[PDB]
Design a protein around this ligand. Structure first.
Ligand SMILES: N[C@@H](CCC(=O)N[C@@H](CSSC[C@H](NC(=O)CC[C@H](N)C(=O)O)C(=O)NCC(=O)O)C(=O)NCC(=O)O)C(=O)O
Lengths: 219, 219
């Protein structure tokens, strides 16, 4: 293996693993990405399923913590943040009321943005029958998810606590992947405040290089 | 309008608010079910969006925390299990590594079970045209979720800590609902560990009470 504190197993095409990569980079935590070859169904391999019985990437092993294994990308984020962000540069303090709001937005991301964007992708590209009513249903719902973000981000700087947190960050990877799936999408034209919020973050070198590494791999 | 500690807004045919209802029951907390009618599109009214900008049930108001507002059913559950369950009857210690294994499972529930269960129900009843293949896709997926739980509960009686936790509890309402959207489905024969695990919890009068009330308000 390596000497890194974290082993982060991802599918290169996925939004989820790179989101943990962002959070890792923001926190100056050492980590080593291990590609899972989903094309070969390595994610359904017994080796991988010892890490995550769900058999879907990502999974994280914290070697700096007794080789502690954990999956579900949102929880990976929370774990890494609650534990290693002592000075709370990009997280709300545990136990405080803001922490649970932060948590709400992370659920909005993982339950609301994730699954729905994914269905839109599914029916655009991968579903075995071309169904416009289904593609339409999730196109609509992805737009609706921008509107929800715009509803807040046009009134406040960040999702929670007057600063950029892991809650804001969670949304970046999918938000950037989803645009190809939307008809003539003009992000700053259609959702001005959410666009600025997305680009501000994606501009950060701690988020720029991981996503740059993603881009090189996908080509 | 009332004098209980919580104002739980939910829609009756939804798994989510009842998931929070169970926990409020388990924690010996008073609360007032405020019905928000989805058939009436009441989740999209100015007043409920003042509480949840996503315009989706459920949402929580803690009158013991100065009318605190929070949504995302799993984020709500996490708030009250953390702020109240001090004896830790049905929670892990906030700060322990078990806590984040318990969070992982709630995310699997929130992101994995809910959305795919939800899309099964949708293409069966509410989608504007009838698509066997879409119905077939979420059936498959829903069954897959069961095999994930089963792979786990056949080797340990609980998800985390050797105790019943909000991790386990949060699967209950969706698991009881989905069974009728599967053809020729025999829970025990198909997923024996999960079957027993589910039913067990569903016996608990803590759990059995609000779920009984969901039955009447659905007659
Ligand atoms: N992650 C969120 C999930 C919240 C959630 O799913 N809320 C639902 C509960 S209503 S229950 C599920 C609801 N069903 C319906 O809207 C069908 C009801 C019928 N059309 C009628 O006439 O009442 C639904 O959203 N189906 C689509 C899907 O599941 O993807 C809701 O508010 N839906 C209203 C809306 O989204 O506008 C949480 O846990 O809090």
């Amino acid at each position: 293996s390596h000497d890194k504190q974290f082993s982060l197993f991802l599918h290169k095409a996925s939004a989820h693993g790179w989101k943990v990569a962002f959070v890792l980079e923001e926190l100056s935590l050492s980590y080593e990405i291990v590609l899972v070859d989903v094309a070969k169904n390595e994610q359904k391999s017994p080796e991988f399923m010892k890490l995550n019985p769900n058999g879907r990437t990502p999974a994280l092993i914290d070697h700096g913590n007794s080789d502690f294994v954990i999956w579900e990308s949102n929880a990976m984020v929370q774990y890494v943040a609650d534990k290693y962000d002592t000075e709370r540069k990009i997280s709300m303090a545990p136990g405080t009321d803001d922490f649970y709001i932060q948590l709400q937005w992370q659920y909005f991301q993982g339950t609301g943005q994730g699954p729905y964007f994914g269905q839109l992708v599914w029916f655009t590209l991968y579903h075995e029958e071309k169904i416009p009513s289904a593609v339409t249903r999730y196109k609509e719902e992805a737009l609706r998810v921008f509107s929800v973000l715009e509803r807040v981000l046009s009134n406040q700087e960040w999702l929670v606590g007057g600063k950029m947190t892991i809650a804001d960050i969670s949304f970046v990877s999918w938000n950037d992947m989803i645009v190809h799936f939307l008809d003539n999408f003009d992000f700053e034209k259609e959702f001005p405040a959410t666009a600025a919020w997305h680009y501000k973050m994606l501009k950060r070198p701690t988020i720029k290089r991981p996503w740059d590494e993603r881009r090189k791999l996908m080509s």
